[PDB]
Amino acid sequence: RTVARDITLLECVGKGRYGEVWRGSWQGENVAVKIFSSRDEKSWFRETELYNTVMLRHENILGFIASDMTSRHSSTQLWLITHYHEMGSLYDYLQLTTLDTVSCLRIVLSIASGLAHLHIEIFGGKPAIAHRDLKSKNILVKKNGQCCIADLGLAVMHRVGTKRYMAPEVLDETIQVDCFDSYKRVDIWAFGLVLWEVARRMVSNGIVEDYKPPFYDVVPNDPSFEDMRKVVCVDQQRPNIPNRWFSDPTLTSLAKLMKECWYQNPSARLTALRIKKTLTKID
Numbered sequence: 343r344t345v346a347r348d349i350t351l352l353e354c355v356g357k358g359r360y361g362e363v364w365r366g367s368w369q370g371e372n373v374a375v376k377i378f379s380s381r382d383e384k385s386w387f388r389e390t391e392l393y394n395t396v397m398l399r400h401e402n403i404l405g406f407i408a409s410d411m412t413s414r415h416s417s418t419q420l421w422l423i424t425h426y427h428e429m430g431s432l433y434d435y436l437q438l439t440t441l442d443t444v445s446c447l448r449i450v451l452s453i454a455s456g457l458a459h460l461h462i463e464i465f466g467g468k469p470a471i472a473h474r475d476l477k478s479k480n481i482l483v484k485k486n487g488q489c490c491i492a493d494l495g496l497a498v499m500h501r502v503g504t505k506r507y508m509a510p511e512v513l514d515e516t517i518q519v520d521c522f523d524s525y526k527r528v529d530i531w532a533f534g535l536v537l538w539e540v541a542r543r544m545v546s547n548g549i550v551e552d553y554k555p556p557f558y559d560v561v562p563n564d565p566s567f568e569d570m571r572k573v574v575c576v577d578q579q580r581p582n583i584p585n586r587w588f589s590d591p592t593l594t595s596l597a598k599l600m601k602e603c604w605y606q607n608p609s610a611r612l613t614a615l616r617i618k619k620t621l622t623k624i625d
């Protein structure tokens with residue numbers, strides 16, 4: 343039989359040190375093609391090894407289609423092919439969109455749902471998985487108003503994470519590296535920062551905050567490991583909760599939830615399943 347493998351690359355939608363992401367076409371359908379730099383080959387290998395272990399299928403996880411390795415004259419070409427989400431990343435979306443109560447809750451609950459699915463061991467099933475680089479650029483917006491989590495290149499089953507989103511135990515190197523729950527608790531910290539990013543863009547009483555990344559007011563762009571350690575570990579700063587949130591019951595509840603993702607003590611932080619339950623009881 344015929345195995346049609348040609349993908350037409352149509353538009354570059356992302357370029358970085360990782361490599362590039364392209365909108366592509368296969369058999370008349372959009373796909374996303376991540377082309378890896380040689381410097382980030384281990385991210386392709388880790389995502390490929392994970393999907394060869396467990397074929398994750400979840401509405402809030404970016405959908406896997408293929409991993410391809412192709413021999414070139416003097417190099418190896420590595421592609422990861424996934425579902426394509428034309429609305430782009432949550433980071434992108436929040437710059438130029440504000441949210442209402444329903445659309446804010448739907449976004450954050452969908453992220454919590456994807457994260458809880460990664461974290462949970464299922465017997466019969468899937469290993470527990472920690473993401474290790476959760477951030478708004480690694481979350482895509484779907485047309486139905488839910489999101490999905492992307493990029494399992496650092497994931498661990500039971501490159502470093504983006505420094506702006508690193509938990510205090512990563513920055514002060516006290517993380518218990520042989521306890522898998524440690525890695526879940528690092529993801530919860532990052533989730534809380536994403537929850538703060540999104541909540542800022544929810545309108546209440548005619549007020550909204552501008553899009554800003556976590557810690558925009560206390561560290562430079564491309565903050566160093568030391569910059570972050572001083573803020574998060576030494577001074578123990580946390581993102582600001584504006585006064586206007588305390589006039590809105592949804593933002594009041596989201597502020598409480600953020601607080602419980604940001605405890606210095608990793609074992610005090612909420613679990614993804616508890617976050618889901620709390621979000622389902624808001625509004």
Ligand SMILES: COc1cc(-c2cncc(-c3ccc(C4CCN(C)CC4)cc3)c2C)cc(OC)c1OC
Nearest residue numbers: 343344345346347348349368373407408409410423
């Ligand atoms: C190798 O490379 C690529 C292949 C494809 C692709 C194209 N047509 C058909 C297929 C196909 C799927 C599944 C079966 C099954 C049928 C039932 N039988 C009992 C076992 C085998 C056969 C064929 C594939 C996998 C797409 C690609 O990219 C989108 C590929 O490149 C990454």
Ligand SMILES: COc1cc(-c2cncc(-c3ccc(C4CCN(C)CC4)cc3)c2C)cc(OC)c1OC
Nearest residue numbers: 344345346368369371372373406407408423424425
């Ligand atoms: C990689 O991705 C895509 C693949 C395909 C595709 C192409 N040929 C054949 C298949 C297939 C047929 C049949 C089985 C069998 C397996 C065992 N048993 C006997 C029942 C079912 C499995 C696989 C598929 C899935 C289509 C896609 O989209 C429409 C893909 O997505 C981009």
Ligand SMILES: COc1cc(-c2cncc(-c3ccc(C4CCN(C)CC4)cc3)c2C)cc(OC)c1OC
Nearest residue numbers: 355363374375376422424426427430479480492493
């Ligand atoms: C985070 O990581 C990965 C993401 C993706 C991915 C999947 N769907 C869609 C996208 C995308 C599409 C379009 C825009 C723009 C272009 C049009 N307009 C001007 C604004 C919107 C941005 C982004 C991406 C980047 C795939 C990946 O791998 C194949 C990723 O890596 C794991």
